């Protein structure tokens, strides 16, 4: 049950300087990137083209190439239309794609953020502001919705191209997507004292980490955030707060799908 995401981030420093950079995710694996520096969209996987032919991908990339230049001018021109209401620096962010469900089902989304706040989306056959959005965006919205050609393209991108493409990706990237890498663990410590069970190298994201005395799961164990490694595996740590000289017979048990029922138990 996977979500495809096209994260775009655009900084407009002043009247004449901007950059637009994109990264693309399928679940928690990167499939593409597009640096401002580059004329073309980069694959970060062997299967990033999906099941699209070369001719289909070139036409798709060319649409984006025209979009990026066109997007840059439009923002610049929308700032002029609104000024002095809003001025630079400005940060535009888009989050777009589709979440895939079993059978043939999917929802597509295209959400826009202005200075870090979600304000606009494409919905149905038009742009609209979401709740909380400042009412001055109604002029930008009226202007964007005048562009009939863009509406029809975006509707085709959201309704048809996204789900079709992502069906292709999941077929093409099944083995990378369904990969199983094993966690490795280690222990450590730092008037109280805090024990730390480190777990690292595991894929996919789901994992269980408890501190234990025998069978007694120490309901007290604080779970950290999922931090990434550079090789598309995950890192997590669980801390437990204890009295000094009370570390005897404490263990860290971790369960994970790659271990095949054979849990890692480390004893202090």
């Amino acid at each position, epitope marked *: 049950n996977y979500t495809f995401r096209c994260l775009q981030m655009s900084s407009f420093a002043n009247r004449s300087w901007s950059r637009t950079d994109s990264v693309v995710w399928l679940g928690d694996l990167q499939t593409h990137r597009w640096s401002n520096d580059s004329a073309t969209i980069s694959f970060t996987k062997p299967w990033s083209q999906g099941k699209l032919s070369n001719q289909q991908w070139e036409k798709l990339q060319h649409m984006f190439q025209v979009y990026r230049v*066109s997007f840059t001018r439009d923002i610049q021109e929308l700032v*002029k*239309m609104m000024s002095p209401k809003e001025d630079y620096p400005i940060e535009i962010q888009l989050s777009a794609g589709c979440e895939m469900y079993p059978g043939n089902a999917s929802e597509s989304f295209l959400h826009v953020a202005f200075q870090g706040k979600y304000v606009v989306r494409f919905w149905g056959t038009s742009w609209q502001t979401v709740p909380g959005a400042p009412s001055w965006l109604d002029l930008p919205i*009226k*202007v964007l919705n*005048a*562009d009939q*050609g863009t509406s029809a393209t975006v509707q085709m991108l959201l309704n048809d191209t996204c789900p079709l493409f992502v069906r292709g990706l999941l077929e093409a990237g099944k083995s990378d997507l369904e990969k199983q890498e094993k966690p490795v663990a280690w222990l450590s410590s730092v008037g109280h004292r805090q024990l730390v069970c480190h777990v690292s190298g595991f894929y996919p994201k789901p994992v269980w980490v408890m501190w234990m005395r025998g069978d007694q799961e120490q309901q007290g164990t604080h779970r950290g955030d999922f931090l990434p490694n550079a090789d598309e595996t995950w890192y997590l740590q669980a801390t437990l707060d204890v009295e000094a000289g009370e570390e005897a017979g404490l263990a860290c048990r971790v369960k994970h799908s790659s271990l095949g029922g054979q849990d890692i138990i480390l004893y202090w």
Partner: T-cell receptor
Amino acid sequence: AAVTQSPRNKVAVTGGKVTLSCNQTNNHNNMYWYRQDTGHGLRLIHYSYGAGSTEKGDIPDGYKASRPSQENFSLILELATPSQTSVYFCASGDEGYTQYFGPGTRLLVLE
Amino acid sequence: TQVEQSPQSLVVRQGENCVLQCNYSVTPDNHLRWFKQDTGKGLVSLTVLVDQKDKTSNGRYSATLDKDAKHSTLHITATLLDDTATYICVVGDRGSALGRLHFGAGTQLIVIP
């Protein structure tokens, strides 16, 4: 959707102040000033998105623009020159792409 | 010069047809418009083409647009004397007011009566 331009025809001397004006009763936010010289297409000088706004076009040098109101977008040549001999066209529009053009103003700047 | 017209000028006898090219490199190309301009007067719109492959008509004026070739023609059937005018090609690069219009330098028609 009608657009008017005054004057329609002007003879002026180098160093003079010339003011081409363009009135528009359609309540269009947006207005545009072009000039047409033989062997070129129309080229954008200045434009406006509303009362108070003025924006530089492709060939703004020599001209100041002025949008005092929704109705009037005025093109001001502060120190006229013979190079500014042209036929000047004004235009207006709302959010759509159509620009509704005025009838044209002929300017000759003599020495 | 992102919009080029051919011929630069042409002379035809009354009743004859003629064809006017416009080629462009403007990106993107939302729509293409053909203007008629009488000597002294200003800009009268004849037609506006919007589709990828498009065809329009307006009495004796007909026109095509192919956006892959980035090319448009204007056909005048059965020329009258009043057609003596400069004909101007214009490409708008957006479907909204955010667009710039890119103007051709014209094709000068003369119809001999």
